[PDB]
Every structure is written in structure tokens, then in C-alpha cells.
Amino acid sequence: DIVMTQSPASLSMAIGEKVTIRCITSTDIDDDMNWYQQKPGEPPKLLISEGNTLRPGVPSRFSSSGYGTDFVFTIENMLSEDVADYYCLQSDNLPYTFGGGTKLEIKRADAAPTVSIFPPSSEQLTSGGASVVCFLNNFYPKDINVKWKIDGSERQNGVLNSWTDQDSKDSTYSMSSTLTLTKDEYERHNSYTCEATHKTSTSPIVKSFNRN
Amino acid sequence: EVQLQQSGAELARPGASVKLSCKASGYTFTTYWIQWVKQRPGQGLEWIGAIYPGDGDTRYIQNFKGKATLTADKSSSTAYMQLSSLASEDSAVYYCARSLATRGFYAMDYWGQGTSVTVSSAKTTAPSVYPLAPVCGDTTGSSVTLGCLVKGYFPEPVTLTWNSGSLSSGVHTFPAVLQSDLYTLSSSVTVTSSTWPSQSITCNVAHPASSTKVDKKIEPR
Amino acid sequence: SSTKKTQLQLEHLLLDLQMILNGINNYKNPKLTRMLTFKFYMPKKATELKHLQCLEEELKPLEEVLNLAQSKNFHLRPRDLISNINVIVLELKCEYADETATIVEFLNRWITFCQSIISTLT
């Protein structure tokens, strides 16, 4: 087949800056390149069809160029509505084949996370479980480090982490870190804390609680 | 106008078969190729094959020959994809989509909404829903933040809402995490300090698979 | 002049069809696989010149295939060629089969139709 190498895999761009995505084809496709945009939970939308044809209704700051083996997709100026994945598809010969895609996220100022810690609910404790939950909300950039402490001393194991996609209104990220304990080990300790280390400062964010 | 409606989410055991459908309206169902596309969770788009409904002719990428079987019913304007000998790497969302012109292969403009197929031995199990309020000695910020913990369900997905959808800004619902064939997610909502616990806050959790639908009021400690 | 005029229009049509066919059949096209997906419809009976109506109604799908047929070694003018074909048919001038045809079969069928009529006129 014809492989298409789409690059970069990820890109972050400030508002109104120009954006460039590239697809390179393992053979000569003679301009049979297509560009799709996919937002979460939605089917991909055809933005540009072969011959650099903008689809009807598509914003005019989308454009593409290329003939042969090297193709470029361009957003003239980043708007936040353009956060999404972009895929190219060659329609030149069978099998049809897609590039691996591009995750396009917007840049904004650094923003410190808002941290909230939550002890296991009494209802979870009734049925034997014990999960401590930590929400680190609306921070930028995405890279964040979370550290758990029981009675002063850290614990690495039993911790799960999960990020939202870039929020639509303010372009920030959020993150749930949940530490699963045994209800027994939970009942043997008083202080529980999560630590947030982020680019926004060296002095981390500490949230903690006493079991009584 | 031109529309493509796909069938619903499916759970299947390893080795079984499943048959997805795609019902088409708004155009001459017979003169357009219909393409099928696989998308593994968190991954890229993947072309499978295509059918010309006017006569049943098919195309396949090589390593789906035998896995996928494309058919069409011209009377109902419907296309079907049979998947056989299901393994886990068949768990994915499958789209159908129409080539943008007649009688020939083209890129796809009109898309179905997708059908999610999960392939697992693990059994459907309803979710446990726990409320998350700050502890007794809770220090007050300007806004307050509460949560909902949805543990031990299978398969995906669950719908999460606050105050029957009334509460939609300042909601983060984090993606589900799979551990020992049970899913766990959580959702947070941020409201104004004043409005709680003076006005009730509730998470509603829907698990279509086990057809369960819970409400958890969040009450201070 | 119609004695050799009708025969000559049919010979011109034949050469256009044959040129398209040779171009497809001789030179290695990376787009061939995509050209073969194109679906052409075929007359039930094609015996008289009247049946050339059935050709005209597939000129839009044919023109598209001609875009795919150009390469580094096979050069063509899809729009001019289709226009000449439409002219000749409209001058010399419908129920189909359930069977769809590839561009190759479509071209061969119409080339053989022409050759039969032309053998009549000799």
C-alpha cells in the first residue's frame, strides 16, 4: 500500500498563530490528499477534499497544498474552536489509507491547578472499599506531577491518574488522581495528603485531611 | 438531509460474531460506495473495506479479508458489517461513511455517528456510585467543589450529569480507567460556596448496559 | 454524403474508444485499482444506432474515469474527448441490465458494437 506519515503527532499553538501539518506519502498520489477534523465523541469531518478543495461551509482559514508526495495542511490563524485531531487520507489507490493523525491544542498563559481532596465516603466504607480522591482542576500546561502522603510518608503504589481533554471555555486541563487503599490500612492512619508539582511554581500545592 | 444512522453499542465474547448496521437516507442508496472505518480507543482511523449497494460488490484491505463481511439490503437502504472470530483488538468504534460522488471510490463526506464494539469475557455489572464532599474540618474557598465516584462497572460508557443536567458549567468528568475488568471514573462540579448545602446538589449516573440510573445527593459531613 | 459520412463518424467514435482502452491496457497506472471501482451500466440490447442513447447517459461517469487515466506516459484531454464522443453519438442517434461493468468491459462492449455496425457499412 501507500503509507502516509503525518507529522507532528502533537502541536500546541498560541491564538491567531499559523498552524502547519504535513503528510508525506510513500508513493506518488498526484494530489489525491484529503484532510479531516475530529472533535471528541464525533465522527471525523471532511475539511478539504482532493485537489485542495475546501468543503462547503468550512472556515476559509483552512487551506492545503501539495502535488506528488509532500502535502501540507494550514490553519491561517488558530482559533480555540480548532482544538481537535486532524487526519489525512489518500484517495489515490486501494487500499485507502489514513495518516496517523495530529493532536492540535491551544496555548494559553500558565495557570495553577485548583486542588481538592476528598476522603472515602461513608457509603464506600460500609461496603469495604477506601478510595481517596484528588481533583487538580483548570491548570495549564498539561504536565503535572502528583504525590501522595500518608502520615507524612509518601506512597507511590495504588494511585491512578486521569486527564480531561483541553477544556472548551478556558483551554485548561484537569486531572483526577485517586489512591485506592485497603479499608484496613485506611483505618490505621490519620493524615492523607496530595501534592501538586507544576511549572507554575516550585512551592507545590498541598491538600490534606485528618481521618478524624 | 443525507443521513447515515448506525446501530447501537455491542458487547461480545471472544470468538463470537457481531453484525453492525448503517441505514441511509437522503440520496440514491444504489449509486454510492459506502466505506467502513475502524477506530481503536484513543487511536487513529483505519480503513476496512467498502460496498457498492447497487450490486453487492466489495473491496477489503487484505488483513480484514475474512474478519469483516460487507452486505447490503437495497430495499431498506441499509448496509451491514459482520465481524467474525472477535478478539480484543476488535474492540473499537466502527463508522460507515459515504463516498462524496457516485459510481466510484472517493473520500467520505457523510458519516455515521459510530458503533462501539467491546470484546470481553467479563460480565455486565452495574456501577456503584459514591458521593464526595469535603471532610468535617473543611476550609472554605471562594467556590466549593464536590464529586461523584463511579466504581466497578462494565462495559463502557456511563452518562454523568449534575442536577439533571441543570448544572453543566464547571463540570469535569474524567475518562474511565479499567482495572481488573471493571471501570472507574469520577466527576467533579464546582459551585458557589453560598449555594451548598443550602441548595441540593446531585449527580445522576446512567449505565445503559445494565439499564440502571442512580441519583446521589451530596450532603455535607 | 451520408454513405461514408455515417461510416466515418462511427470510425471516429471507434478510434476514441480504442485509444482510451489501449491507454488503460498498455501503461502501468498506480490509480488502476481506483479506476476499477467505478461502476458503469450496460444496455440490455445494443444492435442499432438508436441504442447509442445508452452510451450518452454514461458519459458523465466516463469523463471522471478519464481524469484517472492520465499518467506520465498516457496523455489525454478528457473534456475535449468526451465532447467529441457526445457530438458523434447525438448525431448518429434505454434499458440496462442488472449487471454493472468495469471501464474495461464498458469500453470493450461499445468497441464491439461499433465494429459490428462498421462491418455492416463495408
Residues 6 or more apart whose Cβ sits within 8 Å of residue A21? A6, A7, A8, A11, A72, A73, A74, A86, A88, A102, A104
Residue A77, helix vs strand vs coil:
coil
Same domain, B142 and B183: yes
Residue B110, helix vs strand vs coil:
strand
Provide the 8-state DSSP code for A43.
Answer: -
Surface-to-core class of residue A104, CB atoms within 10 Å of its CB (0-12 exposed, 13-18 middle, 19+ buried): buried
Residues 6 or more apart whose Cβ sits within 8 Å of residue A52? A31, A63, A64, A65, A66
Provide the 8-state DSSP code for B56.
Answer: T
Which residues of C are less than 8 Å from B102 in CB distance? Answer: 61
Radius of gyration, alpha carbons of chain B: 22
Per-residue b/e over B183-194, b at no fewer than 16 CB within 10 Å? Answer: bbbbbbbbbeee
- Return the C-alpha torsion angle B130, B133, B135, B141, nearest 10: 160
How far apart, in whole angstroms, are the C-alpha atoms of residue B2 and residue A203?
Answer: 56
Contact B131, A126 (CB under 8 A): no
Number of domains comprising chain C: 1
CA atoms within 13 A on the CB side of A119: 23
Contact A93, C31 (CB under 8 A): yes
**Which residue of chain B has the CA closest to C98?**
B55
Nearest Cβ partner for B103 among C39, C98, C99: C39
Q: How far is B161 from chain A (nearest CA, A)?
A: 16
Same domain, A146 and A87: no
How far apart, in whole angstroms, are the C-alpha atoms of residue A200 and residue A143?
Answer: 11
Same domain, B93 and B175: no
Contact A135, A174 (CB under 8 A): yes
Same domain, B72 and B139: no
How far apart, in whole angstroms, are the C-alpha atoms of residue A62 and residue A70?
Answer: 17
Helix (H) or strand (E) holding C113: helix C103-120
C-alpha cell of residue B142: 471562594
Same domain, B168 and B187: yes
C-alpha cell of residue A49: 477534499
Q: Last residue of a domain, which of B119, B147, B178?
A: B119
How far apart, in whole angstroms, are the C-alpha atoms of residue A73 and residue A48?
Answer: 9
Q: Do B55 and C38 lie within an 8 Å CB cutoff?
A: no
Contact A95, B50 (CB under 8 A): no
Number of domains comprising chain B: 2
Q: State the SS3 of B113-177.
A: CCEEEEECCCCCECCEEEEECCCCCCCCCCEEEEEEEEEEEECCCCEEEECCCCECCCEEECCCE
Q: How far is C61 from chain B (nearest CA, A)?
A: 7
Same domain, A102 and A121: no
Backbone angles phi, psi at A77, to 5 degrees: -145, 130
C-alpha cell of residue A53: 478543495
CATH code, domain carrying A87: 2.60.40.10
Taking alpha carbons only, the member of A180, A205, A181 closest to residue A193 is A205
CATH code, domain carrying B58: 2.60.40.10
Q: Do B107 and A55 lie within an 8 Å CB cutoff?
A: no
Beta bridge partners of A205: A196
Mutating which of B103, B106, B108 best tests the C interface, going by the most C Cβ atoms within 10 A?
B103
- Residue count of chain B: 221
- What angle separates helix C59-69 from helix C2-26, to the nearest 10 degrees? 50
| Percent helix, percent strand, percent coil in chain C, to nearest 5 | 65, 10, 25
Chains with 3 or more CB pairs under 8 A to chain C:
A, B
Q: Last residue of a domain, which of A40, A75, A106?
A: A106
Same domain, B88 and B25: yes
Nearest Cβ partner for B55 among C38, C65, C100: C100
C-alpha cell of residue A96: 485507502
Q: Do A94 and C31 lie within an 8 Å CB cutoff?
A: no
Helix (H) or strand (E) holding C23: helix C2-26
In A80-200, which ranges are E strands? 84-90, 97-98, 102-106, 114-118, 129-139, 145-150, 153-155, 159-163, 173-182, 191-198
Number of domains comprising chain A: 2
Q: Do A43 and B111 lie within an 8 Å CB cutoff?
A: yes
Beta bridge partners of A85: A38, A103
- What angle separates helix C2-26 from helix C78-92, to the nearest 10 degrees? 140
Domain that holds residue A55: 4-106
How far apart, in whole angstroms, are the C-alpha atoms of residue B54 and residue B31?
Answer: 6
Residues 6 or more apart whose Cβ sits within 8 Å of residue A199? A110, A141, A143
Q: State the SS3 of A115-135.
A: EEEECCCHHHHHCCEEEEEEE
> Quick one: how far is CA B127 from the chain centroid?
17
How far apart, in whole angstroms, are the C-alpha atoms of residue C113 and residue B100?
Answer: 33
With an 8 Å Cβ cutoff, is C45 touching chain B? Answer: no
Site of grid cell 469535569: B172
Say which experimental method was used. X-ray
Contact B34, B98 (CB under 8 A): yes
How far apart, in whole angstroms, are the C-alpha atoms of residue B18 and residue B81?
Answer: 8
